[PDB]
Amino acid sequence: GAYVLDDSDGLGREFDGIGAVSGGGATSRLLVNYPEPYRSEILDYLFKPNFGASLHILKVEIGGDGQTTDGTEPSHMHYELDENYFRGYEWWLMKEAKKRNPDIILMGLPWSFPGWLGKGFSWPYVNLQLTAYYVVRWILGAKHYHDLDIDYIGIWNERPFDANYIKELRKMLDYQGLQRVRIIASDNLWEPISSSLLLDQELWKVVDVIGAHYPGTYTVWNAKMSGKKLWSSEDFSTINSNVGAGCWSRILNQNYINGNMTSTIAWNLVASYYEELPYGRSGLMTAQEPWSGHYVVASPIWVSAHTTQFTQPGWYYLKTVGHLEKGGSYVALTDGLGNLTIIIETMSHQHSMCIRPYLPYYNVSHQLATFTLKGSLREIQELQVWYTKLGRLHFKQLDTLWLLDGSGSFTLELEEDEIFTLTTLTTGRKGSYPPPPSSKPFPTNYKDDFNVEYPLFSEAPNFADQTGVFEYYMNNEDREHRFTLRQVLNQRPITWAADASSTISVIGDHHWTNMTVQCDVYIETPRSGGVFIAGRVNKGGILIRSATGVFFWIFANGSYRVTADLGGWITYASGHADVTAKRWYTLTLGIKGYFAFGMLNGTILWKNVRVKYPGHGWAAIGTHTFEFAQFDNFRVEAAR
Ligand SMILES: *[C@@H]1O[C@H](CO)[C@@H](O[C@@H]2O[C@H](CO)[C@@H](O)[C@H](O)[C@H]2NC(C)=O)[C@H](O)[C@H]1NC(C)=O
Ligand SMILES: *[C@@H]1O[C@H](CO)[C@@H](O[C@@H]2O[C@H](CO)[C@@H](O)[C@H](O)[C@H]2NC(C)=O)[C@H](O)[C@H]1NC(C)=O
Ligand SMILES: *[C@@H]1O[C@H](CO)[C@@H](O[C@@H]2O[C@H](CO)[C@@H](O)[C@H](O)[C@H]2NC(C)=O)[C@H](O)[C@H]1NC(C)=O
Ligand SMILES: O=[N+]([O-])c1ccc(O[C@@H]2O[C@H](CO)[C@H](O)[C@H](O)[C@H]2O)cc1
Ligand SMILES: *[C@@H]1O[C@H](CO)[C@@H](O)[C@H](O)[C@H]1NC(C)=O
Ligand SMILES: [Ca+2]
Structure with missing residues (x-):
């Protein structure tokens, strides 16, 4: 019935950003040879602020020459004594992202490694210093050849970690003057990283973020106890139809609500790989035809916008978020500068299934919702309104909501499969370029x-x-x-x-x-x-x-x-x-x-x-x- 939004009893967790993954593997392969202007348009839809998906975070694969889902990606060191920081397309992509948004957060993670690191075995932990040396070379190269500051470094994607490796990676980072680089672990399940961090103080010091994959909106007790930032460091992986857009919508809200996760990162950024390759068309948008220039600005772009245009890393979640009575959810964030953002979602089970995990049925039906600005929010009088309806209308700005009272309260009619963003911010825009050529x-x-x-x-x-x-x-x-x-x-x-x-x-x-x-x-x-x-x-x-x-x-x-x-x-x-x-x-x-x-x-x-x-x-x-x-x-x- 009534839902209070208040900052008086303090604030929830710090919001760290929404992002996406380019890599794991060769997911951006066909983007690079798009003709202009189309290539630059696609990048804008992804990275240009107050425009499209306006992403806060870009995570990329550190290519290790191995097959990593939709192809191999080239390493910076093919052989011992070989160094080259101009192979592949992740360097270019990071630079294009940074050109559109200077404050974008950059992350790197290995999926595979060149064989020579294994010194006779197919194993990256045979010589801890050698593997850390290889990874750190990559981070240095980003700075030295591309003026890129990598913010986060991971361990070994979806594979086991070695606690001694993580420690050596920290020591090596510090030795090379990269104290500012943070470590995320272990890009797999909540365990065993979570309990390892509670039993080992030295490990606890070197790990800044617990990043878990496809956690189904939930975390586990050992993770909360760590007091570490919790990220869904890889999620989504769903076909970018309206079905996929619903999945993205729902998890963006509920990853924080149900699991205290303050970042969610979609695999993958753009489907720029042959669709008959594994997990075809599971990017936020589609750009799989460089020879024609045809690309599709898919539904998930606009779902991202509902959060990304109206939030920024460093904002805070309110304590007042949760589920709606008849289904769906609401989150609210501020910035300490008097601004407020409200994001509401009503995704029906039938139209929001993610591939991993599959949720048992839940009901969503017509309802009404009343919100009241308690605490230091009451002094707000006006809210911009953005609306999306899946199944369709996308990211349409509706008439401003005037509180018009002295109440600090308002009410909404919510049907199924809807997103509403209500914010003090005026910067919102459904960015638009002319339609691109037909598919050929x-x-x-x-x-x-x-x-x-x-x-x-x-x-x-x-x-x-x-x-x-x-x-x-x-x-x-x-x-x-x-x-x-x-x-x-x-x-x-x-x-x-x-x-x-x-x-x-x-x-x-x-x-x-x-x-x-x-x-x-x-x-x-x-x-x-x-x-x-x-x-x-x-x-x-x-x-x-x-x-x-x-x-x-x-x-x-x-x-x-x-x-x-x-x-x-x-x-x-x-x-x-x-x-x-x-x-x-x-x-x-x-x-x-x-x-x-x-x-x-x-x-x-x-x-x-x-x-x-x-x-x-x-x-x-x-x-x-x-x-x-x-x-x-x-x-x-x-x-x-
Ligand atoms: C993580 O978020 C959860 C909610 O998913 C918080 O746990 C409690 O949730 C209940 C029911 O929603 C709230 O009434 C309480 O306010 C929460 N209890 C606490 C601990 O205050 C919880 O706050 C979060 N866990 C953290 C931040 O460690
Ligand atoms: C709402 O958020 C905006 C975005 O940051 C704030 O606008 C900036 O505010 C600072 C100081 O508060 C200024 O120095 C910047 O130049 C402002 N940028 C813009 C876009 O004007 C704003 O302060 C916040 N408060 C409200 C409700 O306006
Ligand atoms: C690929 O080649 C085969 C063989 O030439 C083509 O199938 C033939 O098509 C003709 C009529 O167009 C039929 O009368 C033959 O019986 C077919 N051959 C067989 C063995 O089925 C086929 O059309 C070609 N495919 C394409 C799309 O180029
Ligand atoms: O078999 N699984 O359950 C499984 C779960 C998570 C996995 O990690 C991820 O899957 C993605 C596809 O959905 C991509 O392959 C990605 O490269 C990979 O990290 C890979 C396999
Ligand atoms: C869902 O709940 C609504 C309202 O309680 C009810 O009318 C409807 O029959 C339910 N639908 C199903 C199939 O569970
Ligand atoms: Ca030739």
Whole structure:
């Protein structure tokens, strides 16, 4: 019936911000080659203050060369003695975020690590100082090469922590002059980090924030007892339809209400990865077509706005928040400067399911809500009103609410699936750019000769690596193949996911069913080396080991194989071929209906080989193991 909002008996917890994750893995892969103005528009929808999602926090993966959900992301140290702070796209993204919002909060977290850190094992805690040295290098590089101040550093995403590592990471941070950098742990479940912090005082000192994943709006007792800041450091991961927008809406309020969590960070920031990759379209918005410029400003953008435009890190939650009688919730925040924000949500169970965890039914029905400004809030007379209705009307400003009394009270009619933001703030705006081009399938004729001398990014556009890492490569000591694409991993990473045994990058349209793929290939390893080109590749990401399709392999021992699977268990054809290491060959692979054929240097090697049909999927290139190889003059001709 009546709901009191008061600051007289003090304040709730400090609000730390809403944000999103770019990474885990390659989630922003297709954003980088958007043409202007569209690329800059997308970034504004995300990061420009008083405009769109206006995010307070950007968390990114510290690439470790391993597959991390929708691809691999390049590390700053591929090998021992290697340092490079210009690979990938997270540097660029952080800088674009900071350009639009100087006060944005930056976070880094590793998912995988380069294999050499493991010194013989697939384990990052073999040499604690070495792994901490690697991580801290990254933070220094952000400052030195990009003028970026990383605010938070994590441990090992969704994987075990080592208390001695966390301590060494603190010591190393301090030693390198990074006392200001905070540590968040352990980016997994509430335990065992929470009880570890109660039993170990030295550990308690070095951990600033307990970050838990997909906590279903709740925390646990040991966490409250720690007195540490509690963040949902990874949540959401839901398709960005209205259903996903409802999930985001509900958890933004209730993570604080039910679980004392003062930050929530969505995986992921923008769906800029092929949608047939795992968890397709689970970004706050969608930008998965750089070749057309088409992007979608999805519902979750506006749900974010309802909190982000009208709150800032450093504000405080009131003590007066909770659930509504007939369902839904209300939070309220101030800033100590007389401003007040009220955010109300009425998300129906049927339209707010997150993928993790799934909630048992709860009822939401028509109701009325009365709010009374008690304490030092009563002196407010006027409130701006923002309204959103899911299922649709988005982030629409409604007529101002005048209190018009001396009461300090007001009433609302609330139906289902609604968000209301009521605030003293006048800065709100539903930012708008003209509509962008219609969606178009991936070009049915496509070529890249990789002839780019000073590339802006370290890899060619649209190639999404799924195991291994492929980079622009300049080789002055050749005139015919001076500018190529090279797979640069020479050993398996400390994997997070189950990377394939062979390297692979996919490109194009997963709907393609008839296609001709051509590429110049070059094997660097004598006797043992191997490369392939492929078509109808159907799976990638965390499922890359499962990929089927048609794979045309050539080996440096003078052999070829055609397989139905990336693991090469299922043979379509095999035989001999005039192939050695360190020689350039042109490979052609034709796939049509039930039949395939392969050419070597324009000459038929095998023809009318039966493949499974129907089948559809991307084109790809790769290497037999984690080995050096080059590719040049890539072309694809395909029918969807
Ligand atoms: C964490 O938030 C919870 C609510 O989710 C607070 O626990 C109590 O909740 C009841 C019922 O909602 C309130 O009436 C009380 O005011 C709360 N009790 C306390 C401890 O004051 C709790 O305040 C929070 N826990 C903290 C901050 O340690
Ligand atoms: C409400 O919040 C706004 C946003 O901070 C406050 O506006 C700033 O206030 C400080 C001093 O209080 C000024 O130095 C800034 O220049 C102000 N910025 C703007 C946008 O004018 C404001 O003080 C708060 N109080 C209210 C209700 O106006
Ligand atoms: C891929 O190739 C197959 C084989 O050419 C195409 O399927 C044939 O389509 C014709 C009519 O268009 C039928 O009469 C044949 O019987 C089909 N072949 C088989 C074995 O089914 C198919 O249309 C092509 N797909 C696309 C979209 O390009
Ligand atoms: O299998 N799980 O329950 C599971 C739960 C949380 C996980 O962490 C997260 O999942 C996300 C997808 O929803 C992304 O993969 C993200 O990269 C990963 O950190 C990964 C797997
Ligand atoms: C939910 O609760 C309302 C009001 O109490 C009631 O009218 C309705 O039947 C309930 N719906 C279901 C299916 O639980
Ligand atoms: Ca070239």
